[PDB]
Amino acid sequence: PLESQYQVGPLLGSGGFGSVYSGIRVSDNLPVAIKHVEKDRISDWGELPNTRVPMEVVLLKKVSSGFSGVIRLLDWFERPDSFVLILERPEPVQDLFDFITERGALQEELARSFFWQVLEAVRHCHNCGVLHRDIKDENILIDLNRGELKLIDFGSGALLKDTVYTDFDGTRVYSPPEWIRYHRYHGRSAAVWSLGILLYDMVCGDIPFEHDEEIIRGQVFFRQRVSSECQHLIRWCLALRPSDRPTFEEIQNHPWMQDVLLPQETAEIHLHS
Numbered sequence: 001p002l003e004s005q006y007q008v009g010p011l012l013g014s015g016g017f018g019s020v021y022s023g024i025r026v027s028d029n030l031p032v033a034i035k036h037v038e039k040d041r042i043s044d045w046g047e048l049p050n051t052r053v054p055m056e057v058v059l060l061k062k063v064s065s066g067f068s069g070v071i072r073l074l075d076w077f078e079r080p081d082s083f084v085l086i087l088e089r090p091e092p093v094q095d096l097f098d099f100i101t102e103r104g105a106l107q108e109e110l111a112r113s114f115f116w117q118v119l120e121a122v123r124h125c126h127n128c129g130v131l132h133r134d135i136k137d138e139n140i141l142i143d144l145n146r147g148e149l150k151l152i153d154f155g156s157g158a159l160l161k162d163t164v165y166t167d168f169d170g171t172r173v174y175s176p177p178e179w180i181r182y183h184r185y186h187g188r189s190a191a192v193w194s195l196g197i198l199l200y201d202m203v204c205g206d207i208p209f210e211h212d213e214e215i216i217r218g219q220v221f222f223r224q225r226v227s228s229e230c231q232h233l234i235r236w237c238l239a240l241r242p243s244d245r246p247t248f249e250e251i252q253n254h255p256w257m258q259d260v261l262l263p264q265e266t267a268e269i270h271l272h273s
C-alpha cells in the first residue's frame, strides 16, 4: 500500500467532489483516477459491513460490479485528514458538460443514445439501493472510443428509500419544484425530474431553468428545434406534480426512445472513433 501502487499524473479536476488526479496502477499499468476527499468537508458518513467511511464509499461499493455505466470503485485508502478513492478511468474520456460546451446542442440520435445509457445506469443504481441525487452532465463521462457513458460523483447520494427525503445537497437548478417549495421529495421522481433537465440540456445545449421561480412555474421553452416526441418526453419528466412524472419503464417505452443506437455505433457515427 502507501502510494507505491499508483503513479500520480495530472490533476483532472477539483470542486465539491474533491480533487481528482489521473493515475496509473503500477502493478498492471491500468488507467485509474485518484480522488482525494478531505474529512472536514464530508457531510454524510456511512458504515461498511463489519468501520466509519464516507457515504460515497458505501454507495460506490453497492454499485461497483460488472455493469459498466457507473465508474467503479477499485480500492480506497484512509489518511489522517482525507480519504483517497481509486476509481476506473476510461481512455480517452471527456465529461458530458465539456462535450456539450464544444459541440452545442446534440443531434437527437446522439442524445437518444446518451440518454438511454444514462437511464440504464440510473436503473442500475436504484436496483442496488442507491440514489445518486446529482444527475447532471458534469457527473457523466464519455468513453470516446467505445461510446459508453459513465456515472460519477456519488458524494451527494443516499441509500434508496420509499419515504420522503428532507435533505438535499445536489445541484439546485436540477432540483425538483417540490424541493424548492417544501424541502420534501421522493427519490425516483426527483431523479426523473433531473433526467428531464439533463435531456433538455442535451438537445438544447443548456439547462431550461436558472432561477427558483422558473422551476416552480415549470414552463418549458425550447430555444432549439426539437422533435415533438422529444419535447413531450421532456415535459413529461418535468411535470410539476411528482406523481404525474413517468417511471423509468415509461421513459424507455416512450416513442422517442425507440431504436437506440448501440454504444459502439454511437462512437463510430458521432464521436468518429
Ligand SMILES: COc1cc2c(-c3cc4c(Cl)ccnc4[nH]3)cn(CCN3CCN(C)CC3)c2cc1OC
Residues within 6 Å of the ligand: 012, 013, 014, 015, 020, 033, 071, 087, 088, 089, 090, 093, 094, 095, 097, 098, 138, 141, 152, 153
Ligand atoms: C478527463 O478530463 C476531465 C475529467 C474530469 C473529471 C473527472 C474525471 C473522472 C474520472 Cl476519469 C473518474 C472519476 N471522476 C472523475 N472526474 C471531472 N472533471 C471536471 C468536471 N466539471 C467540469 C466543469 N466544471 C465547471 C466543473 C467540473 C473533469 C474534467 C476534465 O477535463 C476538463
